[PDB]
Coordinates of C-alpha atoms and ligand atoms in Angstrom, one line a residue:
Chain A
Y1 CA -13.8 -5.8 14.2
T2 CA -11.0 -8.0 12.9
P3 CA -9.8 -7.1 9.4
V4 CA -8.4 -10.6 9.2
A5 CA -9.8 -13.7 11.0
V6 CA -7.8 -16.9 11.1
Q7 CA -9.2 -20.3 12.0
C8 CA -6.5 -22.8 12.8
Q9 CA -8.4 -26.1 12.3
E10 CA -7.3 -29.7 12.4
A11 CA -5.7 -30.1 9.0
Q12 CA -6.7 -26.8 7.4
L13 CA -6.8 -23.1 8.0
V14 CA -9.7 -20.7 7.1
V15 CA -9.0 -17.1 6.6
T16 CA -11.7 -14.5 6.4
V17 CA -10.8 -11.0 5.0
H18 CA -12.9 -7.8 4.9
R19 CA -12.9 -6.1 1.6
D20 CA -12.9 -2.7 3.5
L21 CA -9.5 -3.9 4.3
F22 CA -8.0 -0.4 4.7
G23 CA -11.3 1.3 5.7
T24 CA -10.6 3.9 3.0
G25 CA -14.3 3.7 2.0
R26 CA -13.4 1.8 -1.2
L27 CA -13.9 -1.9 -1.2
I28 CA -11.1 -3.9 -2.9
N29 CA -11.8 -6.3 -5.7
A30 CA -12.3 -9.9 -4.4
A31 CA -10.2 -11.3 -7.2
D32 CA -7.3 -9.0 -6.1
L33 CA -6.9 -11.2 -3.0
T34 CA -5.0 -14.5 -2.9
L35 CA -3.6 -16.9 -0.4
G36 CA 0.1 -17.8 0.0
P37 CA 3.0 -17.5 -2.5
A38 CA 1.0 -19.8 -4.8
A39 CA -1.7 -17.2 -5.1
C40 CA -4.7 -19.6 -4.5
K41 CA -8.1 -18.2 -5.3
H42 CA -10.7 -17.5 -2.7
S43 CA -13.1 -20.3 -1.8
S44 CA -16.2 -18.2 -1.1
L45 CA -17.6 -14.7 -0.6
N46 CA -20.3 -13.2 1.6
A47 CA -22.0 -10.0 0.2
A48 CA -23.6 -9.3 3.6
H49 CA -20.6 -7.6 5.1
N50 CA -18.4 -7.8 2.0
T51 CA -15.9 -10.5 3.1
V52 CA -13.8 -13.0 1.2
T53 CA -12.9 -16.4 2.6
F54 CA -9.9 -18.6 1.8
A55 CA -9.6 -22.2 2.9
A56 CA -6.6 -24.4 2.4
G57 CA -4.8 -27.5 3.7
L58 CA -2.0 -26.7 6.1
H59 CA 0.6 -27.7 3.6
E60 CA -1.0 -26.2 0.5
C61 CA -0.5 -22.9 -1.3
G62 CA 3.2 -22.5 -0.4
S63 CA 2.9 -22.4 3.3
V64 CA 6.1 -22.9 5.4
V65 CA 6.3 -25.1 8.5
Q66 CA 8.7 -24.6 11.3
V67 CA 9.1 -27.5 13.8
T68 CA 10.1 -26.4 17.3
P69 CA 10.7 -28.6 20.3
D70 CA 7.1 -28.5 21.5
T71 CA 5.1 -26.8 18.6
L72 CA 4.4 -26.7 14.9
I73 CA 4.1 -23.3 13.2
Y74 CA 2.6 -23.0 9.8
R75 CA 3.2 -19.6 8.0
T76 CA 1.7 -18.1 5.0
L77 CA 0.2 -14.8 3.8
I78 CA -2.7 -13.0 2.1
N79 CA -1.7 -11.1 -1.0
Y80 CA -3.4 -7.9 -2.1
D81 CA -2.5 -7.2 -5.7
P82 CA -4.4 -4.3 -7.2
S83 CA -5.4 -4.8 -10.9
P84 CA -3.5 -2.8 -13.5
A85 CA -4.4 0.7 -14.3
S86 CA -6.5 1.4 -17.4
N87 CA -3.2 2.9 -18.6
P88 CA -0.5 0.5 -17.7
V89 CA 2.2 3.3 -17.6
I90 CA 0.9 4.5 -14.2
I91 CA 0.2 2.9 -10.8
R92 CA -2.4 4.2 -8.3
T93 CA -2.2 1.5 -5.7
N94 CA 0.6 -0.5 -4.1
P95 CA 0.5 -4.3 -3.5
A96 CA 0.1 -5.4 0.2
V97 CA 1.0 -8.5 2.1
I98 CA -0.5 -9.9 5.3
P99 CA 1.3 -12.4 7.4
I100 CA -0.7 -15.5 8.5
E101 CA 0.3 -17.9 11.3
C102 CA -1.0 -21.1 12.8
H103 CA 0.2 -22.8 15.9
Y104 CA -0.3 -26.4 16.9
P105 CA 1.0 -28.4 19.9
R106 CA 3.2 -31.4 18.9
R107 CA 2.7 -35.0 20.1
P117 CA 19.2 -48.2 22.1
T118 CA 20.5 -45.1 20.3
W119 CA 21.1 -45.0 16.5
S120 CA 23.1 -43.6 13.6
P121 CA 21.6 -41.9 10.4
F122 CA 24.3 -43.5 8.3
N123 CA 24.2 -47.2 9.2
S124 CA 20.4 -47.5 9.5
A125 CA 16.9 -46.2 10.3
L126 CA 15.0 -49.2 11.8
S127 CA 12.3 -47.0 13.5
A128 CA 9.9 -44.6 11.7
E129 CA 10.8 -42.6 14.8
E130 CA 14.5 -42.6 13.9
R131 CA 14.4 -39.4 12.0
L132 CA 16.4 -36.2 12.2
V133 CA 14.5 -32.9 12.4
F134 CA 16.3 -29.9 10.9
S135 CA 15.2 -26.4 11.6
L136 CA 16.1 -22.7 10.8
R137 CA 15.3 -20.1 13.3
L138 CA 15.4 -16.3 13.0
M139 CA 17.1 -15.0 16.1
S140 CA 17.6 -11.7 17.9
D141 CA 20.9 -9.8 17.7
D142 CA 22.0 -11.4 21.0
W143 CA 20.9 -15.0 20.0
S144 CA 19.0 -15.3 23.3
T145 CA 15.6 -15.8 21.7
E146 CA 13.7 -16.1 18.5
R147 CA 12.5 -12.9 16.8
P148 CA 9.6 -11.7 14.5
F149 CA 9.7 -12.1 10.8
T150 CA 8.6 -8.5 10.4
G151 CA 10.1 -5.0 10.8
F152 CA 13.3 -5.5 8.7
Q153 CA 15.0 -2.6 6.8
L154 CA 18.0 -2.5 4.6
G155 CA 20.9 -2.1 7.0
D156 CA 19.5 -4.6 9.4
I157 CA 21.0 -8.0 9.9
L158 CA 19.4 -11.5 9.8
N159 CA 20.8 -13.7 12.5
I160 CA 20.0 -17.2 11.3
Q161 CA 20.5 -20.3 13.5
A162 CA 20.6 -23.8 11.9
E163 CA 20.1 -26.8 14.2
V164 CA 19.4 -30.4 14.2
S165 CA 17.5 -32.5 16.8
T166 CA 19.7 -34.0 19.6
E167 CA 17.8 -37.1 20.8
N168 CA 19.0 -40.7 21.0
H169 CA 21.6 -40.6 18.2
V170 CA 25.3 -40.3 17.8
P171 CA 27.0 -36.9 18.1
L172 CA 26.7 -34.9 14.8
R173 CA 28.2 -31.8 13.3
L174 CA 25.8 -29.7 11.3
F175 CA 26.7 -28.0 7.9
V176 CA 24.8 -25.7 5.5
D177 CA 25.5 -26.7 1.9
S178 CA 23.6 -23.8 0.4
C179 CA 21.0 -21.1 1.1
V180 CA 19.1 -19.4 -1.6
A181 CA 16.7 -16.4 -1.4
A182 CA 13.7 -16.0 -3.6
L183 CA 10.2 -14.5 -3.7
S184 CA 8.7 -17.9 -2.9
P185 CA 9.6 -21.2 -1.1
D186 CA 10.8 -22.4 -4.5
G187 CA 14.5 -21.4 -4.8
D188 CA 14.7 -22.4 -8.4
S189 CA 12.3 -19.6 -9.4
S190 CA 13.2 -16.1 -10.7
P191 CA 14.5 -14.0 -9.2
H192 CA 16.8 -15.8 -6.7
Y193 CA 20.1 -15.1 -5.1
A194 CA 22.6 -17.5 -3.5
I195 CA 23.7 -16.6 0.0
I196 CA 25.6 -19.8 0.6
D197 CA 26.9 -22.0 -2.2
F198 CA 29.6 -24.4 -3.2
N199 CA 29.1 -26.7 -0.2
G200 CA 29.4 -24.2 2.7
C201 CA 31.0 -21.1 1.1
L202 CA 29.2 -18.0 2.4
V203 CA 29.6 -16.1 -0.9
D204 CA 27.4 -13.2 0.1
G205 CA 30.2 -12.0 2.4
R206 CA 32.7 -12.0 -0.4
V207 CA 31.3 -9.1 -2.4
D208 CA 30.3 -5.4 -1.9
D209 CA 30.4 -4.1 1.7
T210 CA 28.6 -7.0 3.4
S211 CA 29.6 -8.3 6.9
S212 CA 27.9 -11.7 6.2
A213 CA 29.7 -14.5 7.9
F214 CA 29.4 -17.7 10.0
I215 CA 29.8 -17.2 13.7
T216 CA 32.6 -18.8 15.7
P217 CA 32.7 -20.7 17.9
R218 CA 29.6 -22.8 17.7
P219 CA 27.4 -23.4 20.7
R220 CA 27.3 -27.1 20.0
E221 CA 28.7 -29.0 17.1
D222 CA 25.2 -29.7 15.9
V223 CA 24.5 -25.9 15.6
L224 CA 25.6 -23.5 13.0
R225 CA 25.0 -19.7 13.2
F226 CA 25.5 -17.0 10.6
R227 CA 24.7 -13.3 10.0
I228 CA 23.3 -12.1 6.7
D229 CA 23.0 -8.4 5.7
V230 CA 19.4 -7.8 4.7
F231 CA 18.5 -7.1 1.1
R232 CA 15.6 -7.0 -1.3
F233 CA 14.8 -8.0 -4.8
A234 CA 14.7 -5.4 -7.5
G235 CA 11.3 -4.9 -9.0
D236 CA 9.6 -6.6 -6.1
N237 CA 6.9 -4.4 -4.6
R238 CA 5.7 -7.0 -2.1
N239 CA 8.9 -6.7 -0.1
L240 CA 9.3 -10.2 1.1
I241 CA 12.1 -12.8 1.1
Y242 CA 12.0 -16.6 1.5
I243 CA 15.2 -18.5 2.2
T244 CA 15.6 -22.2 1.4
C245 CA 18.7 -24.0 2.8
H246 CA 20.1 -27.4 2.4
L247 CA 21.4 -28.8 5.6
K248 CA 23.4 -31.9 6.2
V249 CA 25.3 -33.7 8.9
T250 CA 28.5 -35.7 9.4
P251 CA 29.8 -37.6 12.5
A252 CA 30.9 -35.1 15.2
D253 CA 34.6 -35.8 14.9
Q254 CA 35.0 -36.2 11.2
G255 CA 37.6 -34.0 9.6
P256 CA 36.1 -31.1 7.5
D257 CA 36.9 -31.1 3.8
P258 CA 36.1 -29.2 0.6
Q259 CA 32.7 -31.0 0.5
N260 CA 31.8 -30.6 4.2
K261 CA 32.7 -27.1 5.6
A262 CA 31.6 -23.7 6.8
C263 CA 33.7 -20.9 5.2
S264 CA 33.3 -17.2 5.5
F265 CA 35.1 -14.4 3.7
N266 CA 36.9 -12.0 5.9
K267 CA 37.2 -8.6 4.1
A268 CA 39.5 -7.3 6.8
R269 CA 42.1 -10.1 6.1
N270 CA 41.1 -10.7 2.5
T271 CA 40.9 -14.5 3.1
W272 CA 38.4 -17.3 3.6
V273 CA 38.2 -18.7 7.1
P274 CA 36.5 -22.0 8.2
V275 CA 34.5 -22.3 11.4
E276 CA 36.6 -25.4 12.1
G277 CA 39.2 -27.3 10.1
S278 CA 42.4 -26.5 8.2
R279 CA 42.6 -23.1 6.6
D280 CA 43.2 -24.5 3.1
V281 CA 39.9 -26.3 3.0
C282 CA 38.3 -23.0 1.8
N283 CA 40.6 -22.6 -1.2
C284 CA 37.9 -24.0 -3.6
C285 CA 35.6 -21.2 -2.5
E286 CA 37.5 -18.5 -4.3
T287 CA 37.7 -20.6 -7.5
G288 CA 33.9 -21.1 -7.3
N289 CA 33.9 -24.9 -7.7
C290 CA 34.1 -27.3 -4.7
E291 CA 33.0 -30.3 -6.7
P292 CA 35.1 -33.5 -6.4
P293 CA 36.8 -34.5 -9.7
Chain B
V10 CA 21.7 -37.5 5.4
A11 CA 20.5 -34.1 4.4
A12 CA 17.3 -32.0 4.3
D13 CA 15.9 -28.7 2.8
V14 CA 14.5 -26.2 5.2
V15 CA 12.6 -23.0 4.4
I16 CA 12.5 -19.9 6.5
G17 CA 10.0 -17.2 5.7
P18 CA 8.1 -15.2 4.8
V19 CA 10.5 -12.4 5.9
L20 CA 8.7 -9.0 5.5
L21 CA 10.6 -5.8 4.7
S22 CA 9.4 -2.2 4.8
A23 CA 7.3 -0.9 1.9
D24 CA 9.6 2.2 1.6
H25 CA 12.1 1.8 -1.2
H26 CA 13.9 5.0 -0.3
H27 CA 14.5 4.1 3.4
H28 CA 17.8 5.2 4.8
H29 CA 19.5 5.6 8.1
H30 CA 18.5 8.8 9.9
Chain C
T2 CA 22.9 18.6 7.1
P3 CA 24.6 16.7 4.3
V4 CA 23.3 19.2 1.6
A5 CA 24.3 22.8 1.3
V6 CA 22.5 25.0 -1.2
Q7 CA 23.9 28.4 -2.4
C8 CA 21.2 30.4 -4.1
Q9 CA 23.3 32.9 -6.2
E10 CA 22.4 35.6 -8.7
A11 CA 21.8 33.5 -11.8
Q12 CA 22.9 30.1 -10.6
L13 CA 22.7 27.6 -7.8
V14 CA 25.5 25.7 -6.2
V15 CA 24.7 22.5 -4.4
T16 CA 27.3 20.7 -2.2
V17 CA 26.6 17.1 -1.1
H18 CA 28.6 15.0 1.3
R19 CA 29.3 11.4 0.1
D20 CA 28.6 10.2 3.6
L21 CA 25.1 11.1 2.7
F22 CA 23.2 9.0 5.2
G23 CA 25.4 9.5 8.3
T24 CA 26.5 5.9 8.5
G25 CA 30.1 6.5 7.5
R26 CA 29.6 4.6 4.3
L27 CA 30.6 6.8 1.3
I28 CA 28.5 6.8 -1.8
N29 CA 29.9 6.9 -5.3
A30 CA 30.2 10.4 -6.7
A31 CA 28.9 9.3 -10.1
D32 CA 25.7 8.0 -8.5
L33 CA 24.7 11.6 -7.8
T34 CA 23.0 13.9 -10.4
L35 CA 21.1 17.2 -10.5
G36 CA 17.5 17.7 -11.6
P37 CA 15.3 15.4 -13.8
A38 CA 18.0 15.9 -16.5
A39 CA 20.6 14.1 -14.4
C40 CA 23.3 16.7 -14.9
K41 CA 26.7 15.4 -13.8
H42 CA 28.7 17.0 -11.0
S43 CA 30.9 20.0 -11.7
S44 CA 33.7 19.2 -9.1
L45 CA 34.8 17.0 -6.2
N46 CA 36.6 17.9 -3.0
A47 CA 38.4 14.6 -2.1
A48 CA 39.7 15.8 1.3
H49 CA 36.1 16.3 2.6
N50 CA 34.5 13.7 0.3
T51 CA 32.1 16.2 -1.2
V52 CA 30.5 16.5 -4.6
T53 CA 29.4 19.9 -6.0
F54 CA 26.9 20.7 -8.7
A55 CA 26.5 24.1 -10.3
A56 CA 23.8 25.1 -12.8
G57 CA 21.9 28.0 -14.2
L58 CA 18.6 28.6 -12.5
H59 CA 16.8 27.4 -15.7
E60 CA 19.0 24.5 -16.6
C61 CA 18.7 20.8 -15.7
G62 CA 14.9 20.6 -15.6
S63 CA 14.3 23.0 -12.8
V64 CA 10.8 24.4 -12.4
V65 CA 9.9 27.9 -11.6
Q66 CA 6.8 29.1 -9.7
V67 CA 6.0 32.8 -9.9
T68 CA 4.2 34.1 -6.8
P69 CA 3.0 37.7 -6.3
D70 CA 6.2 38.7 -4.5
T71 CA 8.7 35.9 -5.1
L72 CA 10.3 33.5 -7.6
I73 CA 10.8 29.9 -6.5
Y74 CA 13.1 27.6 -8.5
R75 CA 12.7 23.9 -7.7
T76 CA 15.0 21.0 -8.5
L77 CA 16.5 17.9 -6.9
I78 CA 19.5 15.8 -6.3
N79 CA 19.1 12.1 -7.4
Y80 CA 21.0 9.3 -5.8
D81 CA 20.9 6.3 -8.1
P82 CA 23.1 3.5 -6.9
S83 CA 25.2 1.5 -9.2
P84 CA 24.3 -2.2 -9.7
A85 CA 25.0 -4.7 -6.9
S86 CA 27.4 -7.7 -7.3
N87 CA 24.3 -9.5 -8.6
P88 CA 21.8 -7.0 -10.2
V89 CA 18.8 -9.1 -9.2
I90 CA 19.1 -7.7 -5.6
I91 CA 19.5 -4.3 -4.0
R92 CA 21.6 -3.6 -1.0
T93 CA 21.3 0.2 -1.1
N94 CA 18.2 2.1 -1.7
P95 CA 17.9 5.1 -4.2
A96 CA 17.1 8.6 -2.9
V97 CA 15.8 12.0 -3.9
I98 CA 16.5 15.3 -2.2
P99 CA 14.3 18.3 -2.9
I100 CA 16.2 21.6 -3.6
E101 CA 14.7 25.1 -3.4
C102 CA 15.8 28.6 -4.2
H103 CA 13.8 31.8 -3.3
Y104 CA 14.4 35.2 -4.9
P105 CA 12.4 38.4 -4.4
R106 CA 10.8 39.8 -7.6
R107 CA 11.5 43.1 -9.3
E130 CA -0.7 44.5 -19.4
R131 CA 0.4 40.9 -19.9
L132 CA -1.2 37.8 -18.4
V133 CA 0.6 35.6 -15.8
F134 CA -0.8 32.1 -15.4
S135 CA 0.1 29.8 -12.5
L136 CA -0.6 26.4 -11.1
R137 CA -0.6 25.9 -7.3
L138 CA -0.7 22.7 -5.2
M139 CA -3.4 23.3 -2.5
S140 CA -4.4 21.6 0.7
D141 CA -7.5 19.5 0.8
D142 CA -9.6 22.4 2.1
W143 CA -8.2 24.8 -0.6
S144 CA -7.5 27.4 2.1
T145 CA -3.7 27.5 1.6
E146 CA -0.9 26.2 -0.5
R147 CA 0.8 23.0 0.6
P148 CA 4.2 21.2 0.3
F149 CA 5.3 19.2 -2.7
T150 CA 6.4 16.4 -0.4
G151 CA 4.8 13.7 1.6
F152 CA 2.5 12.2 -1.0
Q153 CA 1.5 8.6 -0.9
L154 CA -0.5 6.4 -3.3
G155 CA -4.1 7.0 -2.2
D156 CA -3.7 10.8 -1.5
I157 CA -5.2 13.4 -3.7
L158 CA -3.6 16.3 -5.5
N159 CA -5.7 19.5 -5.3
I160 CA -4.6 21.7 -8.1
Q161 CA -5.6 25.3 -8.6
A162 CA -5.2 27.0 -11.9
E163 CA -5.4 30.8 -12.0
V164 CA -4.7 33.9 -14.1
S165 CA -3.6 37.3 -12.6
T166 CA -6.0 40.1 -12.1
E167 CA -4.9 42.7 -14.8
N168 CA -6.2 46.2 -15.5
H169 CA -8.1 44.5 -18.4
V170 CA -11.5 42.9 -18.6
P171 CA -12.8 40.0 -16.5
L172 CA -11.9 36.6 -18.0
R173 CA -12.7 32.9 -17.7
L174 CA -9.9 30.4 -17.3
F175 CA -9.7 27.0 -19.0
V176 CA -7.3 24.1 -18.9
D177 CA -6.8 22.5 -22.4
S178 CA -4.7 19.7 -21.2
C179 CA -2.4 18.4 -18.4
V180 CA 0.2 15.8 -18.9
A181 CA 2.4 14.1 -16.3
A182 CA 5.9 12.9 -17.0
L183 CA 9.2 12.2 -15.3
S184 CA 10.5 15.7 -16.4
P185 CA 9.1 19.1 -17.3
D186 CA 9.1 17.9 -20.9
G187 CA 5.6 16.4 -21.4
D188 CA 6.6 14.9 -24.8
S189 CA 9.0 12.5 -23.1
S190 CA 8.5 8.8 -22.2
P191 CA 6.7 7.9 -20.1
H192 CA 3.8 10.3 -19.9
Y193 CA 0.2 10.2 -19.0
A194 CA -2.7 12.6 -20.0
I195 CA -4.7 13.8 -17.0
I196 CA -6.7 16.4 -19.0
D197 CA -7.0 16.2 -22.8
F198 CA -9.3 17.1 -25.8
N199 CA -9.6 20.7 -24.7
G200 CA -10.8 20.5 -21.2
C201 CA -11.9 16.8 -20.8
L202 CA -10.7 15.4 -17.5
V203 CA -10.0 11.9 -18.9
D204 CA -8.4 10.6 -15.7
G205 CA -11.8 10.5 -14.0
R206 CA -13.2 8.4 -16.8
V207 CA -11.5 5.1 -16.0
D208 CA -10.6 2.8 -13.1
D209 CA -11.9 3.9 -9.7
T210 CA -10.6 7.5 -9.7
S211 CA -12.5 10.4 -8.2
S212 CA -10.7 12.9 -10.4
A213 CA -12.8 15.9 -11.4
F214 CA -13.1 19.7 -11.7
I215 CA -14.5 21.4 -8.7
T216 CA -17.8 23.3 -8.9
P217 CA -18.6 26.1 -8.5
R218 CA -15.5 28.2 -9.2
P219 CA -14.3 30.9 -6.7
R220 CA -13.9 33.3 -9.6
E221 CA -14.4 32.9 -13.3
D222 CA -10.6 33.3 -13.7
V223 CA -9.9 30.3 -11.4
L224 CA -10.3 26.6 -12.2
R225 CA -9.8 23.9 -9.5
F226 CA -9.5 20.2 -9.9
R227 CA -8.7 17.1 -7.8
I228 CA -6.5 14.3 -9.2
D229 CA -5.9 10.9 -7.6
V230 CA -2.2 10.5 -7.1
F231 CA -0.3 8.0 -9.2
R232 CA 3.3 7.1 -10.2
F233 CA 5.1 5.7 -13.2
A234 CA 5.9 2.1 -13.5
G235 CA 9.6 1.4 -13.5
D236 CA 10.5 4.7 -12.0
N237 CA 12.6 4.4 -8.9
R238 CA 12.8 8.1 -8.2
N239 CA 9.0 8.3 -7.4
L240 CA 8.3 11.8 -8.6
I241 CA 6.1 13.5 -11.2
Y242 CA 5.9 16.7 -13.1
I243 CA 2.7 18.1 -14.5
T244 CA 2.7 20.5 -17.5
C245 CA -0.7 22.1 -18.3
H246 CA -1.8 24.3 -21.2
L247 CA -4.0 27.0 -19.9
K248 CA -6.0 29.6 -21.9
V249 CA -8.6 32.2 -21.4
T250 CA -11.7 33.6 -23.1
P251 CA -14.0 36.6 -22.4
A252 CA -15.7 36.2 -19.0
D253 CA -19.2 35.9 -20.6
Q254 CA -18.5 33.9 -23.7
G255 CA -20.5 30.8 -24.2
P256 CA -18.5 27.6 -23.5
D257 CA -18.2 25.3 -26.5
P258 CA -16.5 21.9 -27.5
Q259 CA -13.2 23.9 -27.9
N260 CA -13.4 25.9 -24.6
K261 CA -14.8 23.9 -21.6
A262 CA -14.1 22.1 -18.3
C263 CA -15.7 18.6 -18.3
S264 CA -15.6 15.9 -15.6
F265 CA -16.8 12.3 -15.9
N266 CA -19.1 10.8 -13.3
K267 CA -19.2 7.0 -13.1
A268 CA -22.2 7.0 -10.8
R269 CA -24.3 8.5 -13.7
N270 CA -22.1 7.3 -16.5
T271 CA -22.0 10.9 -17.8
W272 CA -19.8 13.9 -18.6
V273 CA -20.7 17.2 -16.8
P274 CA -19.3 20.7 -17.5
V275 CA -18.5 23.1 -14.8
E276 CA -20.6 25.6 -16.8
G277 CA -22.5 25.4 -20.1
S278 CA -24.9 23.1 -21.8
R279 CA -24.7 19.4 -21.0
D280 CA -24.2 18.4 -24.6
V281 CA -20.9 20.4 -24.9
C282 CA -19.1 17.4 -23.4
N283 CA -20.3 14.9 -26.0
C284 CA -17.0 15.0 -27.9
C285 CA -15.1 14.0 -24.8
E286 CA -16.4 10.4 -25.0
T287 CA -15.5 10.2 -28.7
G288 CA -12.0 11.4 -27.9
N289 CA -11.9 14.1 -30.5
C290 CA -13.0 17.7 -29.8
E291 CA -11.3 19.3 -32.8
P292 CA -13.1 22.3 -34.3
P293 CA -12.6 21.0 -38.0
Chain D
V10 CA -3.8 33.9 -25.3
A11 CA -2.7 30.8 -23.6
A12 CA 0.4 29.5 -21.6
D13 CA 2.1 26.4 -20.4
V14 CA 2.7 26.1 -16.7
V15 CA 4.7 23.3 -15.0
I16 CA 4.0 22.2 -11.4
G17 CA 6.6 19.9 -9.7
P18 CA 8.5 18.0 -8.8
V19 CA 5.9 16.2 -6.7
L20 CA 7.5 13.5 -4.5
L21 CA 5.9 10.4 -3.2
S22 CA 7.0 9.1 0.2
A23 CA 6.2 5.6 1.4
Ligands
LIG1 C1 23.8 -43.9 20.2 O1 24.1 -42.7 20.9 C2 24.7 -42.9 22.2 C3 24.7 -41.5 22.9 O2 25.3 -40.6 22.1 C4 26.0 -43.5 22.1 O3 26.9 -42.8 21.2 C5 25.7 -44.9 21.6 O4 26.8 -45.8 21.6 C6 26.8 -47.0 22.3 O5 26.8 -46.5 23.7 C7 27.2 -47.6 24.6 C8 27.1 -47.1 26.0 O6 27.4 -45.7 26.1 C9 28.7 -47.8 24.3 O7 29.4 -46.6 24.2 C10 28.8 -48.5 22.9 O8 30.1 -48.8 22.6 C11 28.2 -47.6 21.8 O9 28.0 -48.4 20.7 C12 25.0 -44.9 20.2 N1 24.7 -46.2 19.8 C13 24.8 -46.7 18.5 C14 24.3 -48.1 18.3 O10 25.2 -46.1 17.6

């Protein structure tokens, strides 16, 4: 008995869910189940054992792809959203969320600035959620307030000129769309880690870097008010410059140090972070 | 030369009164 | 522990450490209040980062249960954190701490509601409920010198405080004995049959909570009443439950048709 | 002869 069956097919996934999802004796309403942050409707149902099936392209319905060195991981979820109570003032049942994952095996140097002759001449950026010690990748589940997200940004290192990686901005939201409500800016103003400027957070970029094409940072976990699904998506804007180019107010990684009450770059001159405090790092 | 990468979904605990010990 | 309670003669005094969660991080004094009424603190001891509340045993929305040999006053401390740098997110969770005071006690009728375990054998704790659980409530009336009686519940109303006329509120029982909660949605709410005694009335209610309420608690105020133990039930004095299976109302005792006014939503005598 | 009795506070844990 598998409450949730996942078929990872060639260019689609097929999820089958039992309506006795909690085995509480009460079957859930088929329409209360949806797929991914987009809430796609089910594709079919089978009254024989009371199941509901969802089928979607690997890129549809708000799925999220991570590209690792030797695999592709597509991640999405099943939503259970109970229908409102006859009287709206009360709530008898909480919304649930079920993580869904699909794994697939993957298949004259150059510069990204001057040209891209080959289809193959393409940078692959990635964000990874790492363990406290940064040794290995860690699960997307089990987080509590008071825990810390260790995020590692990196860019592929093959057959190109040495690069230095930067994070222009990160934004958390309840879906992969960062322009949706609600949302909160972790990094902003071209590399200013503004989350570590306020309250009692210890959010910061880590120094030194492992390579110039890797940027690490720690973020204190949080959640969105009014959100009963208890999830977080984070969309970052990464960019690169040549590995020996001087950092400046447009290309930097600055953290606020509460202990010294100052901004501190991962590299570069101290005064490059000045525009972080003013909240505007846009060239005149 | 930039790009937008998404990380998630990150799942938190259902307990909105959760506190340290 | 981080909460000391002094149960004194006609007042309680609660002392709370601001390092409430044992992490070293001190909460704001103003984020603590007493009872559903949210009474402000009475004093602060800065040297020990403590916050003290003092209130009469009947103030601040406390709730008294009268048992055969004891009086139990129940209240709580609320921690309601102040808004984050950006109010769309939350960095620190709310909290609620139950507070209890026991006092030995020292023909009129005494009514009581008790929260019972699923087997009805014993009374159970007011904590540990989750959405999906069931409240087993037992209404009863003391055994006086006087004649045998029959107990009825006119109405129950849940709210965020002992005042049922406050917002929000929800009617569990209404229209003089109609258990309207069991009429809608997929609830199994009903009166239990048969009764243990004629002066006892049991019912099960599917747990719920109020939208927008971050404290996650509920109070239930019922109106109980009695009639002679052998008086015919009527549209004014009854205990009716709804059954979805048969789409009908069913009294615990009495003629089936007594529950008719339940569906119409008016059981006035007029 | 009637009366109003209050039961609570009932706390939900998650
Ligand atoms: C591509 O990347 C290479 C490895 O990082 C290296 O930077 C290379 O540059 C050419 O390499 C030659 C032999 O090492 C000489 O150094 C030559 O001067 C240099 O152009 C990069 N090539 C290009 C075309 O950018």
